Amino acid sequence: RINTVRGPITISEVGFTLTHEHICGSSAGFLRAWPEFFGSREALVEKAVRGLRRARAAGVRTIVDVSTFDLGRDVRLLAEVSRAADVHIVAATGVWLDPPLSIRMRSVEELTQFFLREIQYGIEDTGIRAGIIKVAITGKVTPFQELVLRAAARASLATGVPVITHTAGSQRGGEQQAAIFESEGLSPSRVCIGHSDETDDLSYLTALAARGYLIGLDRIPHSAIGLEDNASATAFMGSRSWQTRALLIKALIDQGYMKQILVSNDWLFGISSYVTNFMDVMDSVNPDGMAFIPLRVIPFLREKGIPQETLAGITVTNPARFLSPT
Amino acid sequence: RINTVRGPITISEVGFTLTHEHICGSSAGFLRAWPEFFGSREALVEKAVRGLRRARAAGVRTIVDVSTFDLGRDVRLLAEVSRAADVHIVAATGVWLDPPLSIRMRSVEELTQFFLREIQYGIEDTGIRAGIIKVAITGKVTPFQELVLRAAARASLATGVPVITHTAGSQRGGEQQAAIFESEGLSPSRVCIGHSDETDDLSYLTALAARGYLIGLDRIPHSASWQTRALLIKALIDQGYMKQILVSNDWLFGISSYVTNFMDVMDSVNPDGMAFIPLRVIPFLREKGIPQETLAGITVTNPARFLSPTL
Ligand SMILES: [Cl-]
Ligand SMILES: [Cl-]
């Protein structure tokens, strides 16, 4: 069974899944300390409920919120929004790119114990258990990031929950992450190399898929095309069109790796970890929010000739296989 | 009146005050996410209550917990420990040395609003209002630290609450901070230049004191000698600056922001904890001939004048 912020669900209940999302991108404790940065907590909840309900109308049944402790994960927020939108949310453990000292001073053994607490016992005092481990790296894996990857591998092996990654500031990092994961004996079928739609290097994508990794083509709506005079948008969202990202889905299908593909928007309903009012910039690029995948990318791939049951396999079957602990 | 984690108190209730302390040195949300790092939340509470009760029995009536959001300040922990030990605790706003992105991406105007929120409205959803602003800087003030210092001055100017600082990685640095504070129009009498016992340059400290800054001699037991640091108190008294001295331990009862089990190292060096100032430093100064009344001025009068909001 798969643990969600409302409790455990069966594989049949997962449905159409977005595998790389967030309710809010923040920092530990920040939403509780300065909710007015988001207007108010109540406003953020309203926005996320409206957005998740729109995604639900368009067919979404589950999202994976990959927010870690250091990205400000507030599981009580996740649960409130999941319940009011009536959309399943899987919560994450792990470490993103902004660990505070209390995290980045820890050893691999200590990190392993922290992840196991959040998966096996619960997050904070809530009893809500994580269903995925998120890890993020920078171009060249730092010593501390290698400790995070090894601890993630150890926690996945103990619990069966999967690991999802991404690399910042580099269009490729999967080969370096995969080498660490395999040195710990982790099966590639437990790992999603996230944000792989940041590159057009098909050789790199196919070789990872061929080893059994999941390929997260999961920032599809992120494009600053038309926002050239806004340098902060270009840096965060890139200069490649959503179509260019989506066609990587077609390319991996066409090479026989339909079962290795996971798709998402990498959206959120508030963000404080970047420049002020960046939420408004993202919203102006993609008014559809989390509904971008079902409403625009799916029809786009159908128009290019991909059969509907292959798309159903990518959006339903693959994420259920990935999330189910094994 | 002075805001504490149990509400406002009058100056006369403040009493003997330790001006630079912590209950827990951590990171935002960490005690809530991994209480087992400290054994348990219950174990940290019991340790802190015992330690504060020991300090109270040695004469302490108030501590200033200078822990900021990014040092893991948990005002509900502070309120629980304050009530159990019957020691007043003043909580802090500001920014320490480990701001997360949601803080260090912010402008001076945004940081000002955040500090004002914590002073004027309350911390998180608790209604507990900060009574001091803490700012930490490193050797050569960074552009971000300068924004923090200016936001601190602006919040102080709007509320009357004082500012305490310190420079990590150097034995001086007060002049850098003073220049920024004065450029904002902040009175030196609202500012304590903390960790000033880390230098032996007596002429540097005397010059700051003559400009009206408070001098925080507040890491005395971290000589790991403490007597030499404590003689700086007598030296500043002899220069005529008794009214400008604040003394403390810079102690805590748990710490996760450094190496694992550093708390055990600290406890082995200073088993007196927060009672080190009243049990060791005060008798040392009296034995060196400082009158009782001068010691009461430093430990009672100066902190109340500093903490009392003064616009
Ligand atoms: Cl992320
Ligand atoms: Cl501090």
Numbering used by the authors:
A (entry chain B): 36 to 361
B (entry chain A): 36 to 259, 276 to 362
The authors write:
The strong chelating agent 1,10-phenanthroline was used to remove the co-purified and tightly bound Zn(II) ions to permit lanthanide binding in the active site of PTE-R18. However, in the 9.5 keV structure an anomalous signal visible to 6σ was present in the active site; this signal was not present in the 13 keV structure above noise. The anomalous signal was suggested to be a result of the Cl K edge (2.8 keV) and thus was modelled as a chloride in both structures given the proximity to Lys169 and the abundance of NaCl in the sample from the purification buffers. However, in the apo structure Lys169 is decarboxylated and thus is capable of adopting two conformations. In both structures residues 260–275 of chain A were unable to be modelled due to a lack of electron density, whereas in chain B these residues were modelled into clear density. Previous directed evolution of wild-type PTE into PTE-R18 resulted in stabilization of loop 7, and loop 7 was able to be built into both chains A and B of Zn-PTE-R18 crystal structures. This suggests that the removal of Zn(II) resulted in increased mobility of loop 7, which was observed in chain A of the crystal structure, but loop 7 of chain B was rigidified by stabilizing crystal contacts and was able to be modelled.
Phosphotriesterase (PTE), a binuclear Zn(II) metalloenzyme from Pseudomonas diminuta, has previously undergone directed evolution to change its activity from a phosphotriesterase to an esterase of 2-naphthyl hexanoate (2NH); the round 18 variant (PTE-R18) in this engineering pathway had an additional Zn(II)-binding site within the active site, indicating a loss of specificity for two divalent metals. PTE-R18 was generated from PTE by the mutations H254R, D233E, F306I, I274S, T172I, S269T, M138I, T199I, L272M, A80V, S111R, A204G, L130V, L271F, A49V, K77E, L140M and I313F. Given that PTE is naturally promiscuous for divalent metal coordination, combined with this additional loss of specificity for binding two cations, it was hypothesized that PTE-R18 could have the potential to bind unusual metals in its active site. Ln(III) ions were an interesting candidate, as their larger size compared with Zn(II) ions could result in mononuclear occupancy of the unusual ‘third’ binding site in PTE-R18.
